[PDB]
Design a protein around this ligand. Structure first.
Ligand SMILES: Nc1ncnc2c1ncn2[C@@H]1O[C@H](COP(=O)(O)OP(=O)(O)O)[C@@H](O)[C@H]1OP(=O)(O)O
Length: 161
């Protein structure tokens, strides 16, 4: 189909999750995730889907796609696909996690929307980590700003052909 993006929020070290939680509290990043994904397709792995609250999934106003090897998986209000390539048939897709799906998706992706949270969390065994980019990606790293709580963050908007 077409435009494949990745979206995530990471500490400066690349930690995106620890102990099965987002490792900070940042409502403005929830607003940012909505504004990027709203009206488009989101793709997630089955474990990510399983971790969302029952009354929160599917995320509203977006086509939710769950990748699973299980043909009988129940993702009420979403659709389930059994290959990544089938999950990218939409005109605009944002891959939202987790690490297994980001690995599969990275070769197809031509945009990354990232939030860096200014927090010092050196990586530990078991952490969920950010996809690793390289020098063929280009774009803007925004200015630091404070959240309402005083937590600082900035935005990356990168692209490649
Ligand atoms: N090549 C592939 N084909 C189909 N489904 C896949 C896949 N790779 C990953 N998945 C699914 O995506 C799941 C992992 O989800 P995730 O990426 O959210 O997890 P994690 O955050 O642990 O990396 C896999 O366990 C698998 O779902 P099932 O266990 O239900 O089969």
């Amino acid at each position: 189909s077409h435009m494949v993006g990745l979206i995530w929020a990471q500490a400066t070290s690349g930690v995106i999750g620890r102990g099965g939680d987002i490792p900070w509290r940042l409502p403005e990043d929830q607003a940012h995730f909505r504004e990027i994904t709203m009206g488009h397709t989101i793709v997630m792995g089955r474990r990510t889907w399983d971790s969302l609250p029952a009354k929160v999934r599917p995320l509203p106003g977006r086509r939710n796609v769950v990748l699973s090897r299980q043909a009988d998986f129940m993702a009420s209000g979403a659709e389930v696909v059994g290959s990544l390539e089938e999950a990218l048939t939409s005109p605009e897709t944002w891959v939202i996690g987790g690490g297994q799906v980001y690995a599969l998706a990275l070769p197809y992706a031509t945009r990354c929307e990232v939030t860096e949270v200014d927090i010092g969390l050196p990586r530990e065994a078991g952490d969920a980590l950010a996809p690793v980019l390289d020098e063929t990606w280009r774009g803007e790293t925004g200015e630091w700003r404070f959240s309402r709580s005083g937590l600082r963050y900035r935005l990356y908007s990168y692209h490649r052909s």
